[PDB]
Amino acid sequence: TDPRAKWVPQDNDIQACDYWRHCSIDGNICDCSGGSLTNCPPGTKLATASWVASCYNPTDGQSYLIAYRDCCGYNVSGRCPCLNTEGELPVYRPEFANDIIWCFGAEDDAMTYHCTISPIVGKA
Amino acid sequence: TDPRAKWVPQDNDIQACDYWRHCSIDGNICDCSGGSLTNCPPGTKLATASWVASCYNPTDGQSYLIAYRDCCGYNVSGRCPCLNTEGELPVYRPEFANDIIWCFGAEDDAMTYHCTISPIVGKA
Amino acid sequence: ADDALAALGAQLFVDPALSRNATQSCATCHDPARAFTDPREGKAGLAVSVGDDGQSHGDRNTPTLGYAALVPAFHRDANGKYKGGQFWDGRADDLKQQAGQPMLNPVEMAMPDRAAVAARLRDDPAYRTGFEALFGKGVLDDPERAFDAAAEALAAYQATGEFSPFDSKYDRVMRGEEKFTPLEEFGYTVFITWNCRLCHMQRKQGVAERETFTNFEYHNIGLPVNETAREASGLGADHVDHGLLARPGIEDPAQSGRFKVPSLRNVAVTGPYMHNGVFTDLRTAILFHNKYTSRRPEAKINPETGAPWGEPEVARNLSLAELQSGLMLDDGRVDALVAFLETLTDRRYEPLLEE
Amino acid sequence: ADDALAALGAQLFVDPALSRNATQSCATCHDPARAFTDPREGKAGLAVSVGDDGQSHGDRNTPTLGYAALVPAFHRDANGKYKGGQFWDGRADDLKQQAGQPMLNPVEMAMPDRAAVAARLRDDPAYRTGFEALFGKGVLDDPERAFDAAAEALAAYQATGEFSPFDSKYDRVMRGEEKFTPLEEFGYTVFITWNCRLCHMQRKQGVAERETFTNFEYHNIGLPVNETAREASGLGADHVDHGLLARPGIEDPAQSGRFKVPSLRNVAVTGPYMHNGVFTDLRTAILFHNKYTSRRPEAKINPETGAPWGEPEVARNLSLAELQSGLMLDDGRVDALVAFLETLTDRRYEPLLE
Amino acid sequence: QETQGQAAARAAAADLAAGQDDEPRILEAPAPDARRVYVNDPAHFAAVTQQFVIDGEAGRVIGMIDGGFLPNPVVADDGSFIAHASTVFSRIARGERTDYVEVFDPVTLLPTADIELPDAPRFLVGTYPWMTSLTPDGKTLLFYQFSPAPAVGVVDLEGKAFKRMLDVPDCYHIFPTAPDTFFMHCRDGSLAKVAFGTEGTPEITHTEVFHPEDEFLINHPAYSQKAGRLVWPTYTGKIHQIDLSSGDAKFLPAVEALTEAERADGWRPGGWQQVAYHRALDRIYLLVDQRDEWRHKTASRFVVVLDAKTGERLAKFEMGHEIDSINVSQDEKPLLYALSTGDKTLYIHDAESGEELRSVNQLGHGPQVITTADMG
Amino acid sequence: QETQGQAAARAAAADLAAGQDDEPRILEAPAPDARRVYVNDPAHFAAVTQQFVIDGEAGRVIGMIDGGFLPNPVVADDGSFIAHASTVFSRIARGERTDYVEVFDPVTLLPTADIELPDAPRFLVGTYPWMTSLTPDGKTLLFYQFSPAPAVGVVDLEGKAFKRMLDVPDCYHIFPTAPDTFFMHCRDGSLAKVAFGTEGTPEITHTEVFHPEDEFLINHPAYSQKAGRLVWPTYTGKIHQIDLSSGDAKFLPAVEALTEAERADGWRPGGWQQVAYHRALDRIYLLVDQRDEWRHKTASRFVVVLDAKTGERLAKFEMGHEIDSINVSQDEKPLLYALSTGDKTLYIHDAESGEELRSVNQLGHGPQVITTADMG
């Protein structure tokens, strides 16, 4: 990969940084530490806050809103690190900003970043 | 760079893992984090315990006893990591054993491992 | 047949002869000119409605009938979450089971019994023709068949496009016909990234075909008693509305104080808000959801009164997992959410938004 | 020439005419048969020595003169540590300044003044001959010059090969003439990896040319009073030995209770141990240093008494940084240290190991 | 053929296409089984560390546990829990030290006990599995203390409380044989039997010396508590076997893992966890390579397999990577796990053919220790 | 051109041959100077992190400081101290959270203050330098809180005590201009001036709006407190400059760091600390490369240098490595510092010719932030 090239989504492997729903992920893919595409790993705490991007699905040619959520309360998993910033805005438009640790609302006031899940919330 | 080959000391660079005094170092060379060959970096605590090896010096053809000392109370430096084991024995002969965190006697009861210095205490 | 059943329901829905003194129809309290809610003032303002005797008040706010036909029948899903049903406490399984209740409720339409309702239907030559065409000869001579038939018709009428048109600005924007303003877009953004999406969206993930901005679950968000409404209702200072736990056959005390998540469609025009009509303004309804977010002085005060929100009527089973979000909505974001929620107003009620 | 001066000093060193009643010489308390320490039993055993008057006992243990010639003259180093000098409290700057002190000390040789020392020197024809040849005619007629010249000869004699021969097993092993036994080698390895090397080694790092197993510094290791030696000394139950703070010109309260780190050469044959002779056995001397390391018995209990060591005489300025090592010596490592320290015995004292 | 990430994409696209809703939530790990394997990452002495919980059959990370400085992991042989002894400081690696034991539920990974150890008693050392050990009943955790003097700490897991330290002789490692008994290895070459009650001084009995002073026994022996079998290699690959199944130490005939030919050609064990033992099969596995005598901690590229009852070589595998530690699953047709510290990867092999089946990469900074439960 | 490790081996061999003795001890760092540079390593969101203190003239690590989760570093301009706001948890990454500020002596690196911040108020975010800032007297540290509502915490460094939180509007970042005043950037496109006291509502005054909603101002602006100059690039390399030296905001003419032709061919800034500003030369340095418009946090391989008064380009350097962050030393003949997160290496260049002069590698796991003092 040329890191500066336009990002090219695929819909065939959720563990790769170019998977279509990961267009604005910053951190680690939860599926690689024992969670799944939309569930957290045992022992971690699911935040209630989220961040949104509009991610193009090459399977059906449609763009979907992905409201990312963090799994919190463990040190960073270190497996399947990815940083994509499709449509990602600076911190003064936080609903689109991905450097913030979005662990708000997690049980037991968990605030450390482990990994991020990628559920769809609507069509753009 | 063959890891299982007999180790060949040099006397020309103290930041390399084949420098002659490092023949039983396990950790990181303190000269790479703000100390020197026989001094601890600022902010760390010099332990009083030690471990010993007989290290051959290619320059003068004599063998010296190096009694290694740990610099403690910081997370491991991460710079110039090295593991040599010339004459290193198992834990039950601890004076010669190098997996132990030899931070005893450090000021402030510092017990975390940051890096190791390589002072000469004698001839062998 | 399916058209005809709904057309019969349409006549019944506006007919005051289904009330004891003949003053009141479903449309008296669910007024089509007000997104199927009650514009009339009673001893508690618009918080609760006055029945056919002209004196009895109910103890819950009359909800909209718009989009009610999208609610699944009452059930407990995989997760042990109760879902669906009708009334704020889900005590009716579905629309057909709910429709006969106002008719016989002595604080509402107050008919003495199913025979009295049958006798009213029998009086009208057009009901005799239209009921018999759909349900068979003699239907109106048998009080049980007649009553069950009227409820079927009413339920069929509420399932028409009249009640659920999907023609709000939100629907036009989703179809690509129109665009949100920056403020409405910001409000949408906030709605789908903050906690609103955890309760007032049909699905947990994926995309809904016909979104009605409710997951149809039951939650206790800790609302206080509406004191003027509870006095008008006459239930007593010591009465507790247990919400879902009052549905016959629910016994689980964890269900106490939980009410059905309302659809937010037409929310801008169906004030006052909550199951007891306690808040006048939409902004105040949104701010009440900040109550459990943080420790700040500002979160504890009702802007309409200048006083604390009040102690919960049921102080157990609060939905703290969702509500304790650790983020308080600032006034900019509440403005944006109000702008967004206004886009959920059906086209025919847009003229109502100004007032 | 310097053979000559040392040869004079050899004469003086065994001459009891330097004591008031002629009953004692340097060699009486510094016996060459006992690595130049005192074999005699007094009221406190071998803890302290009895002077010329037959009754007066000192309050400190008589140390070896072996290797004392390698000690630097007293000074304060750039690190603020006092170093070198002579006596357990470093109150003499060097061997020359020390030599006249026992001659005039009333609890030791008890000469009443320098004039009395000169008079005894002048009465010996061999001393008239030997002193005048090195210092000039009439030296013995002037008490100050006589006393100074006697001190110079004694210091010269103590700086010969005789006092520092470097012929121990340890020296032979370092020269690669022989090897340690397994136990001795384990002892040496403990010595150089545990705290011992921080005080009983000449240098902080590198190799010493003529190692004598002391860094010449001053440390308070928290020793209790030796009650029977204190009693015998007569200094009174109210007396406190302040160590280095007693040296004239030292005022710094942090020096209270500190004593010069002893060379460990010949330690196996120079018991009892410490500045007050309080421990009889070499194993006990080592275990005592275990005191600030643990709550286990090899730490709190004196094996010679079965009771706790007893409160420090001077409870401040303890060398806790060096002594609170976090590691307690077990009996096997104490056995190994004893075996190693035994190899520091000069060849001529090997028969005393016994 | 189809990877996990690919099957997961196919399942997600199908859920999306079919309108299948699912609530985002915290997963539970699958039930512990014979093929669950734990990889601990001491991270080259870092102040915080990680353990990976892995399904060996799929080659999938199924959970993680965070630990502090040089933690010691243990895994109950029955699958009922995991635990570790760990160490944290008030300001990362400086300030007030707290040592503690956590017990975790093996499916939720939630802590079910957090038991503080008073006076900072843990031995902080490169990770040796047998420096912290469970009694066969799973009710007690025993941990080694080196400073100020060797001791063994008794932690009541049932009552969630630290109980006391047992003072021991110059001894190392803890091999528990009963609810109230464990063996240690002494400097002098003997094993010590330590018997302990609720109160009192423990009863301590030594065996005969079993190895000479110039024979070096590695820091990583294999111990099968259910077999009562201690398998202890030396630096040359000579293998000591001690049978502890009668409650007392019985010394078995020593075996040679390498030939006279190979030893004279420089074959020697090397690595971290150099030895593994399979109980049902009664088989020893040993990491070996050609190496200078003082390169004993370097990676090895071969494993030899030998019958424990006779000492006959059964197999010699070329591993194909730089391997530091090995272990096996304790079922029939076991897996041979081969962890590479340098690659940070767990290579998973069939233990009978030595063939590589799958691998799990990105396991932390310097992973070193593999642990499995013997559930049979 | 002997390396530092070779000069050291030669010095040690000379001491050995000379018989020179020296006591092993704890060093002091050299006195802070203009060529001291600090590199912080957020370590890709790990629970613990490190900062490296570097002498840029020698290319030598002179010290390190440990921190917790996503700490914010600050360095006093006059070299008198450095400090961070940091966050730890009672069991590595879970349990009770403690937020605190530490102040360190710049030569012994020992903590001289540890100040708890109540109610866990720090904003946990990938590290932005101007989310925690010193007032120009160095007596007060100001830090940003995002949850539950935007606020600025006031920490009295002289008195070693937390003072208060201040409520602020929907605004971000903190640029101190006086002992009691700082500026922030508002969502609505204005700056807000906040003047505060020990108690009471702060006086908050907005500037005029200065940018549209669709021009995006990066998270890493350069701010020279001594010049009062705020240098704020957008995603396209348009640079806003605000002169705060009067105590109020004055908007300077905007400049374009890239030509129209370069912009048409896809040149845009990118990385983390994309921009540097040299006060005495009044020069702006911007990290740029050819990239798709949403690859704005990838490394860049070029730096453009331009005169801040005229916008004229002075140079375009080819860096020869993948660079994420830049800064400069603030003395004459400055060094340009070019930190590569992927190489974990700081490359030190001559800022006039752009020539790479030396480098310092092994800087942690994902070093991102460079900080220098303006001591001039």
Ligand code: HEC
């Ligand atoms: C005022 C006197 C009313 C008249 C006449 C009717 N209804 Fe109504 N309705 C009223 C209230 C106060 C409530 C809430 C009561 C409670 O206990 O929760 C309702 C509720 C409904 C519903 C449920 C809608 C929902 O839960 O989202 C339906 C479907 C409904 N009402 C229909 C309906 C019909 C068909 C009527 C004529 C037969 C009718 N209502 C009369 C108040 C009043």
Ligand code: HEC
């Ligand atoms: C579940 C925990 C919820 C979350 C998160 C949000 N809402 Fe809600 N809302 C909920 C319930 C159960 C109710 C009715 C409570 C009762 O007993 O009466 C509501 C009510 C509203 C209303 C009033 C609607 C009406 O009276 O018809 C509005 C305007 C509303 N909710 C808006 C809203 C927004 C904008 C939210 C995100 C900030 C939000 N709610 C979160 C359940 C839950």
Ligand code: HEC
């Ligand atoms: C017994 C009564 C003694 C006679 C006769 C001599 N000395 Fe001695 N010596 C004695 C003691 C008790 C001490 C320690 C006193 C103290 O306060 O510390 C000493 C010490 C010395 C030393 C110092 C050695 C050292 O500190 O390591 C020297 C060099 C010394 N003595 C030499 C010496 C000479 C030359 C004597 C004859 C003039 C002599 N001493 C007599 C006990 C006795």
Ligand code: HEC
């Ligand atoms: C500096 C803090 C020291 C360390 C570490 C060790 N020793 Fe020591 N030792 C020290 C002093 C100051 C003294 C004299 C104390 C006094 O006031 O008298 C000693 C004494 C001994 C002795 C007795 C020597 C004799 O009496 O002549 C022995 C045998 C001895 N020391 C041995 C020893 C060993 C083996 C050590 C490491 C375990 C060790 N010491 C540590 C100062 C210090």
Ligand SMILES: [Ca+2]
């Ligand atoms: Ca309403």
Ligand SMILES: [Ca+2]
């Ligand atoms: Ca003695």
